[PDB]
Specification:
- It contains 32 helices and 24 strands.
- It is an alpha+beta fold and 831 residues long.
- The chain has five domains: 1-164, Ubiquitin-like (UB roll) (Roll), CATH 3.10.20.90; 166-295, Immunoglobulin-like (Sandwich); 296-481, Alpha Horseshoe (Serine Threonine Protein Phosphatase 5, Tetratricopeptide repeat), CATH 1.25.40.70; 482-633, Phosphatidylinositol 3-kinase Catalytic Subunit, Chain A, domain 4 (2-Layer Sandwich), CATH 3.30.1010; 634-825, Phosphatidylinositol 3-kinase Catalytic Subunit, Chain A, Domain 5 (Orthogonal Bundle).
- α3 (38-47) runs parallel beside α17, α17 (432-443) runs parallel beside α19 and α24 packs across α25.
- The longest helix is centred in the middle third of the chain and has 26 residues, at 482-507.
- The radius of gyration is 29 Å and the shape is globular.
- Bound molecules: the ligand CC(=O)Nc1cn2cc(/C=C3\SC(=O)NC3=O)ccc2n1.
- Residues 556, 558, 560, 581, 583, 617, 629, 631-632, 635, 713-714 line the site of ligand ZW3.
- Residues 300-479 form the PIK helical domain.
- This is Phosphatidylinositol 4,5-bisphosphate 3-kinase catalytic subunit gamma isoform.
- One of its GO terms (cellular component) is membrane.
């Protein structure tokens, strides 16, 4: 159809990639995947509750934290209900449902409707106690009043979805290599499964010219019979300069046949990019390799005491502890005992000889008896280990996804970014993981909003994964509904225009620069910029017109744009603007990953009734070295506080921060609350930052709210171009009533909090190791090694008892006290 063609054009603009373009493909896998994803999409669409989908309530099944219960008076929660120019306060029980609150309202005021958060598209609806709404917990945590408006539920009609419409050994011939413009060169051909090399062959070395020919059959030791599903033929050019991969068994279970001309990826003169089955779209300047294939469908005891102790010891070790040949042999030999231990699963499946058909068969038999795994309690860390680069088997990965099905929405949000990144480790485009993400996104608008942005971030800048991610995004967009499609259209339009202004102002650069920014912004406000758009990092908020007067260029070497918008919602309780920073020059995909780990650390701390007052601000990567950042209100740089007496001259003073805090507090009650908040937030960042190895920062990259909340910024800056374990300078110590080498009640509180927080993190060692490992593999190329990944295991002091771990961290605090201002001074000189 022609309007079908118009609909596809609309999707193409939202995706930032054309899924119907068949020029960078040597098979129909992506087209097969598009068709394959129709069923799961349609099944999820057919399953959803129109009213609940439209209202997307944001809820949790987790207990109300101890620190939140203490904020509730006499089992009473106050809710202010608005109707027009007047409002009405109502007392409520924490166990009260919004339905019961609504009937409580009509009763109190007598002599079809829905509760919506004032100024936000957030609804307090469904069969859930109010204490279980995320917004209520947000308000309870931050000392804010819960303000609601009584309004009409959104019409589910707005979410309408458009009507859909061999015993021979394996061998490969290396014909030659070609590159248009330019040593000795050879080609290495590996058969890989789960990052491990099953077999390797190489060509003879030849002079490196624009065309190099071999016409050689490379015969492997592996029989065609033994090639596992998901095995890659990895082809590399050494002088490592270039690489490319080819799936040996295709998406239809057929062995690859015939002629291939593969455009290779160049190494920037391990990482997830090195695993891609995509070929380089640049046919003009890339190196190509020409190959030929020619060769089909797919083919009780009792452990003794000591051996059991040995096996149990292997299972107890961390995910990074290497398995010896003996360890693997024990795991495999006593696999029926290993199966009784869910924690053994990653080690056991690493003991599988994936290049032996009979062994893979024995593994499939083993997993048919999955009673222990199925009955076991969901362990996200354990599940995530089975979805990394180490596992290429469909069945193994699928049992990990099976376990994820039990996660509630709030938990899917906590792990969404890293589950999207895990799609990079999947051998085929259509996978259980990709289907899982599609379903959870279509089931919940909040998950779907973030899935859009996370996918779009990779489609905009990854040539390695854009094709796979674009087919997943199209599948989601074909089921989200028209209201969501309209919303995304507006967001994309705004961000594309603001990205233009960001780069334009970047080319220039003063009073001249600010004048030019304001002229470019009026021009946008004139005939391009739509009336409003949902804030990508906070979709409950809608931004309206630019407040031109408040817009400026930041005084940094990356001269980012500081933009302010009016809120588009009339029901908002304040005339406070929405502040957004637009920056070019840093890879914000790295900031996204750090900020998500910080949120995970906060959830861990919550499990142990600890609130460390972190501030993981909104951040979204929109394209190559470009994106948006949430401006935290009433915040200033530690360096700026130092600068405002004395300079500009590295002359750091101890009392300045405490002075600033006192100046910003309207009363002494508020000042004491600010000092308490500083102690907790300083503790939170010292612990978090140390564990992630990002602790040693210049003061210019640490901020504080007038309310005493410390927080680190600019994570991509350090991770892009990567002594003291963390920042605990004499100014921070003075706020805590400490100087030099003495102690105080606040500093003792700080040390106690640090230890508790550090020990709480250590209870989730394996989860933090997997998350850290995946972050480096998918987000920070050039920070791989195994040595880099091992940092977190040293920081988390694995193999130490709690008392030794406590001493270790207290010693780290002392290192900071010994160094004083020395490190900050060297950061200042390194100008
Ligand atoms: C009031 C105020 O200044 N708030 C504020 C500033 N701010 C900055 C960031 C992060 C940045 S700025 C830069 O160049 N790079 C970054 O990563 C985050 C929050 C925030 N709030």
């Amino acid at each position: 159809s022609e309007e079908s063609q118009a609909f596809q054009r609309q999707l193409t603009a939202l995706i930032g990639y054309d899924v119907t373009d068949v020029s960078n493909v040597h098979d129909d896998e992506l087209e097969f995947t598009r068709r394959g994803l129709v069923t799961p999409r349609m099944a999820e669409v057919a399953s959803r509750d129109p009213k609940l989908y439209a209202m997307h309530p944001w809820v949790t099944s987790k207990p109300l934290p101890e620190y939140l219960w203490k904020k509730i008076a006499n089992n009473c929660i106050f809710i202010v209900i608005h109707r027009s120019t007047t409002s009405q306060t109502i007392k409520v029980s924490p166990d009260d449902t919004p339905g019961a609150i609504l009937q409580s309202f009509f009763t109190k005021m007598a002599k079809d409707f829905v509760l919506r958060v004032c100024g936000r598209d957030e609804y307090l609806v469904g069969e859930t106690p109010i204490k279980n709404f995320q917004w209520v917990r947000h308000c309870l945590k931050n000392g804010e009043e819960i303000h609601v408006v009584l309004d009409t539920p959104p019409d589910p009609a707005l979410d309408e979805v458009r009507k859909e419409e061999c015993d021979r050994k394996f061998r490969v011939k290396i014909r030659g290599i070609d590159i248009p413009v330019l040593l000795t060169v050879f080609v290495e051909a590996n058969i890989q499964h789960g990052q491990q090399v099953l077999c390797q062959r190489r060509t003879s070395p030849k002079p490196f010219t624009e065309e190099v020919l071999w016409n050689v059959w490379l015969e492997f030791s592996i029989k065609i019979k033994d090639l596992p599903k998901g095995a890659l033929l990895n082809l590399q050019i050494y002088c490592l300069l270039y690489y490319v991969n080819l799936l040996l068994i295709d998406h239809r279970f057929l062995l690859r046949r015939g002629e291939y001309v593969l455009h290779m990826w160049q190494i920037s003169g391990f990482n997830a990019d090195k695993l891609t089955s995509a070929t380089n779209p640049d046919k003009e300047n890339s190196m190509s390799i020409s190959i030929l294939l020619d060769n089909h469908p797919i083919a009780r005891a009792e452990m003794p005491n000591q051996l059991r102790k040995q096996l149990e010891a292997i299972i107890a070790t961390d995910p990074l502890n290497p398995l010896t040949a003996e360890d693997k042999e024990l795991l495999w030999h006593f696999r029926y005992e290993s199966l009784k231990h869910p924690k053994a699963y990653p080690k056991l499946f690493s003991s599988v000889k994936w290049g032996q058909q009979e062994i893979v068969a024995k593994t499939y038999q083993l997993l048919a008896r999955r009673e222990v795994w199925d009955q076991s309690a969901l362990d996200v860390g354990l599940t995530m280990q089975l979805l990394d680069c180490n596992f290429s088997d469909e069945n193994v990965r699928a049992i990990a996804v099976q376990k994820l099905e039990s996660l509630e929405d709030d938990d899917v949000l906590h792990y969404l970014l890293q589950l999207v990144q895990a799609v990079k480790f999947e051998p085929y485009h259509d996978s259980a993981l990709a289907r899982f993400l599609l379903k959870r996104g279509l089931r919940n608008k909040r998950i779907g909003h973030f899935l859009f942005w996370f996918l779009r971030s990779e489609i905009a800048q990854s040539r390695h994964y854009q094709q796979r991610f674009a087919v997943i995004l199209e599948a989601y967009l074909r089921g989200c509904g028209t209201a969501m499609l309209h919303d995304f259209t507006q967001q994309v339009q705004v961000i594309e225009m603001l990205q233009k202004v960001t780069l334009d102002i970047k080319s220039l650069s003063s009073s001249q620069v600010i004048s030019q920014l304001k002229q470019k912004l009026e021009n946008l406000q004139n005939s391009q910029l739509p009336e409003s758009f949902r804030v990508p990092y906070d979709p409950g908020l809608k931004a309206g017109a630019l407040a031109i007067e408040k817009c400026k260029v930041m005084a940094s070497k990356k001269k980012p744009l500081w933009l302010e918008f009016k809120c588009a919602d009339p029901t908002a309780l304040s005339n406070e603007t929405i502040g957004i920073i637009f920056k070019h020059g840093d890879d914000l995909r790295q900031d996204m990953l750090i900020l998500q780990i910080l949120r995970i650390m906060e959830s861990i701390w919550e499990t142990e009734s600890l609130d460390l007052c972190l501030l993981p601000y909104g951040c979204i990567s929109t394209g190559d070295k470009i994106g948006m950042i949430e401006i935290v209100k009433d915040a200033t740089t530690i360096a700026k506080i130092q600068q405002s007496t004395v300079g500009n001259t590295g002359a750091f003073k101890d009392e300045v921060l405490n002075h600033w805090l006192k100046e910003k507090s309207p009363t002494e009650e508020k000042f004491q609350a600010a000092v308490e908040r500083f102690v907790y937030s300083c503790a939170g960042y010292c612990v978090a930052t140390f564990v992630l190895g990002i602790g040693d920062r210049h003061n210019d990259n640490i901020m504080i709210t007038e309310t005493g909340n410390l927080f680190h910024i600019d994570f991509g800056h350090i991770l892009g171009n990567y002594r003291v374990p963390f920042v605990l300078t004499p100014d921070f110590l003075f706020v805590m009533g400490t100087s030099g080498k003495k102690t105080s009640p606040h500093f003792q509180k700080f040390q106690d909090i640090c230890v508790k927080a550090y020990l709480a993190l250590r209870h989730h060692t394996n989860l933090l190791i997997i998350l850290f490992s995946m972050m480096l593999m998918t987000g920070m190329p050039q920070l791989t090694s195994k040595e880099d990944i091992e940092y977190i295991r040293d920081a988390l002091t694995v193999g130490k008892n709690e008392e030794d771990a406590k001493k270790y961290f207290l010693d780290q605090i002392e290192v900071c006290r010994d160094k004083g201002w020395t490190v900050q001074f060297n950061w200042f000189l390194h100008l």
